[PDB]
Amino acid sequence: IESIIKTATDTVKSEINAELGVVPSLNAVETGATSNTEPEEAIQTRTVINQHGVSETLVENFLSRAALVSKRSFEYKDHTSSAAQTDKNFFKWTINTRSFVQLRRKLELFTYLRFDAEITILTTVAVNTYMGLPNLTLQAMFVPTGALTPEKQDSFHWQSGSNASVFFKISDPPARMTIPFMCINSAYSVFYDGFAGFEKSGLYGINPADTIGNLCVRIVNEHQPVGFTVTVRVYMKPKHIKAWAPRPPRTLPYMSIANANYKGKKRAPNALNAIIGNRDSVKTMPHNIV
Amino acid sequence: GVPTYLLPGSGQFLTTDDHSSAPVLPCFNPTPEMHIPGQVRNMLEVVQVESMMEINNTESAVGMERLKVDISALTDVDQLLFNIPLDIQLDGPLRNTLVGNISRYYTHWSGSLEMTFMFCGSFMATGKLILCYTPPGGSCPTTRETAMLGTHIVWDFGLQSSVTLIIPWISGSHYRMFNNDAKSTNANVGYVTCFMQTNLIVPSESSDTCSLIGFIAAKDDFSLRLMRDSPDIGQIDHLHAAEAAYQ
Amino acid sequence: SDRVLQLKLGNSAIVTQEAANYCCAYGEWPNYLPDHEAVAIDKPTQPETATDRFYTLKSVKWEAGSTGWWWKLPDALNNIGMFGQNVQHHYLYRSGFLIHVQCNATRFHQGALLVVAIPEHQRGAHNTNTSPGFDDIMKGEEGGTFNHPYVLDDGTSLACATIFPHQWINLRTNNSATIVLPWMNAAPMDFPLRHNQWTLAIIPVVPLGTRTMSSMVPITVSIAPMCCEFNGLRHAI
């Protein structure tokens, strides 16, 4: 039954027990229920007034940590003889939570998530001699998924009629935006057991309703006579979080961001056929006190 | 105007700060909330669900053979079957559990544990085991005379094929640390050992080697604090197709 | 008292005598879609006893080196009975499921099955970075076989798979498992031919073993849809 739990529960004292018909330490794993044997029923306990709060394991606290989701370095220079596969003073990024594995395993502890995401953008610059670091203006434009993204630094898509842009400088504090809960469903599917199109040639596991959008970031300045290397780090913090149906954590290393494929490490720990590193026997104690 | 002055800590980005920020989409209406089954509001709900221990974390135990302990009929009395190291920080049998994975996001822990053991022999298989918990201090007990002097439960295999060994919170401090020193007095929990109380006695058509499955959950006096990143996941390179999110 | 159980849905009934207390997933029971959560505005068809009835699948042979079996829902039932005809003639779909798994043997046999229902079981492939295709996922009535059930074929773990709605068939205790599933989706209704809400996984945690005469031990799966709605009537694909 649902109740409000602010601290961990208290222990009551117990006595010698010797009753027929009552066996609380015996259980039934086969029902799928966890054992309800209390510590008062297994040993003799004392009264403990437990004042240990439980507020740090709240799902709001467990997930609302600003985590790196994007890291992109591009050369900020005059791009005339640069190849067309490079970032000519701007980049595009489809917003995902799959690329960096600390937030990914943490969000994949749940099947469904409903959250607002606040987005911190940290820009840092390095000289590509030394003459000083420029205080450049960057534009981060939020483009929805599948819409027209800019193809140039100076394209006319950067004018942002209805697309939300943030203009920010390197010497400022980092730019911070709140992106709302933007799914067309009532929760994001962290896992999607399906195909996202009506044909049999779509992608497995990728629901585009889960995708936030594109993040097109340019430098508004023109090129200086020297080049610079600009690294843009994007940080996502979930907030106002509801979470449903928890899952086993991922044990094997991630291979891709598109799928849940697995290889495992070559030896234990976290190998395919051995998640926990090995000991000599089942009656061998690894860190035995001498 | 209002006379102000900036403090130390002005303009910084703490990753754990709790402020309101600018809406990127004004007058946006989120999707109406639907009831979805199984909402988790505290990660201690997850930690109280029993999950299998890899007690058989040995070589020549490949895959699912690590999730069961094979006991047999013995010809000597008072014999040790298995033992379980109780260090949740350290890569032992308790690491890949629901209580073990969520706790490695934290540094301090407190509260009682429970070990559930399900016997998976035949109906014809009889036997009695003793499941001892030893508070820390000395070595792990290797004989049954030594080990039953601590917290134990004697279990006969019958109509209920399961017991629970409550591992009580017996600590000097309020919390225990997930420090690297497993032999520390702030970290070492103690030992769990299993012995033959009588013997595994089967007839000639039961399989002579039977199995246990060990489970561990946390009780509702369990508590975790001081949050850290998990040592269970990590990368030394970008994942596959991560550059294609920029193309 | 909790060992005997008759499940009566439609013209189908199942009596069992060697059962456990059955599992309702996440404490929830199935229901129809209420008006304050509805999206599609046309009147749904609720065929009830024509579709809310047990559907028994093909049995699987529990053998020596079995790794496990999985069926995806509603994909395992999209071509069976009047459930499959309502699936193929409609665009939308909403139901829960009452899964009953049967496996018995003698009192000289041993073995344990983990019968676990997994929501949104997105699978992974082994030792490749190409995603699984359509035919790897949409098996249908026959279902599939686990390749690496120790990591649940998705890099996670079988040990922590008791966080999902599950039961056990330990052959010395019970011979059946029963899991009642509600609707488990982010959307209130769904297109049943490209998305699976539940995967029934049956996994040999303790293998089958005896020293008596060798009989075939089958594992039978009966699935009853519960509270079926169908919206978007058209032709059949």
Binding site: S3, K6, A33, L58, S64, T178 | P30, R41 | -
Partner: peptide
């Protein structure tokens, strides 16, 4: 401190102490 006109702009809501572990630990019916 929320001077924005949208409700999702606000800070994190760390006051949800409602638990129900019995939907995972005792999901059996009787």
């Amino acid at each position: 401190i929320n001077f924005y006109k949208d409700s999702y702009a606000a800070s994190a809501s760390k006051q949800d102490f409602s638990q129900d572990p019995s939907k995972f630990t005792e999901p059996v019916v009787e």
